[PDB]
Amino acid sequence: GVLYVGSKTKEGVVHGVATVAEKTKEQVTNVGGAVVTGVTAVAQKTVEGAGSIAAATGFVKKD
Amino acid sequence: GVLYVGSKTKEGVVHGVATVAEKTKEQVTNVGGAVVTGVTAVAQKTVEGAGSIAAATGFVKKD
Amino acid sequence: GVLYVGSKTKEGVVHGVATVAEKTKEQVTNVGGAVVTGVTAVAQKTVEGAGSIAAATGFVKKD
């Protein structure tokens, strides 16, 4: 169906995903999949059917 | 069906996902799937059918 | 169906994915999949059918 997204903004400031680490020993940073960001952000029908977004993180450390 | 999203804003400031760590030993940061962000954020029909978003984090540490 | 995205902005500032590490020992940075970003961001039908976005990170450290 119709999906109207109107917008009349002014001086719009947007930050998306942020991350900060410090003085750690090990570091992992996995990001993605459907990360949309912006003054007019739209994300329609990210997954349909048998599709998958397996944004996993297999941290094992098999000590 | 119809989905109208009107907006007349002014001086809009938006922060999305934030994360802060400090003085840790191990660090993991998994983000994503359907992270939408913005002054006019829309997210319609993220998953339909047999689809999946398995944003897991298999932290094992098999000590 | 129709998907109208109108926008009349002015002085729009957008930051997408950010990441900061410091004084760590090991470092990993995996990003992607469907990272969209901008003053007018649109992301329609990222995955359809048997498709997949396996943005994983196989950190093992098989010590």
Add this chain to the structure above:
Amino acid sequence: GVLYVGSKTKEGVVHGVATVAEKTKEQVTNVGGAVVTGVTAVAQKTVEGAGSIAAATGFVKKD
């Protein structure tokens, strides 16, 4: 002596002298002398010594 005028404003709207006439027969409009106007208006020492500001209006109509 010192005359400090500090100001940190935002979205300031100022109107100065206004005048409206309607359906009259005769019309006179004398303005001036020291008409200062603005978001940061200052008017120091307008008249000193034998000076004068004779903003008169000699409407006579010597009928």
Add this chain to the structure above:
Amino acid sequence: GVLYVGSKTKEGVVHGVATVAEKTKEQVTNVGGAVVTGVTAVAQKTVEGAGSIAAATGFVKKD
């Protein structure tokens, strides 16, 4: 002496002298002398000594 005029404004709108007439028979419009106007308006020492600002209007109509 020192005369400091600081200002940190944003989106300042200023109107100075205004005048409106309608359906009149005779019309006169005298303006001036020291008409200062603006977001940072300053008017120092407009008249000094034997000076004069005779912004008059000799409407006679010697009928």
Add this chain to the structure above:
Amino acid sequence: GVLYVGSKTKEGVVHGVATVAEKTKEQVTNVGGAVVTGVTAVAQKTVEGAGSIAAATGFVKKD
């Protein structure tokens, strides 16, 4: 003496002298003398000594 005029503005709109007439029979419009106007308007020492600004309007109509 020192006369400091600092200003850090943004999106400043200024109108100076305005005048509107309509459906009149006779029309006169005298303007001037020291009409200063602007986002940073300054007018120092407009008249000094025996000087004069005789912005008059000798409307007689010696009927």
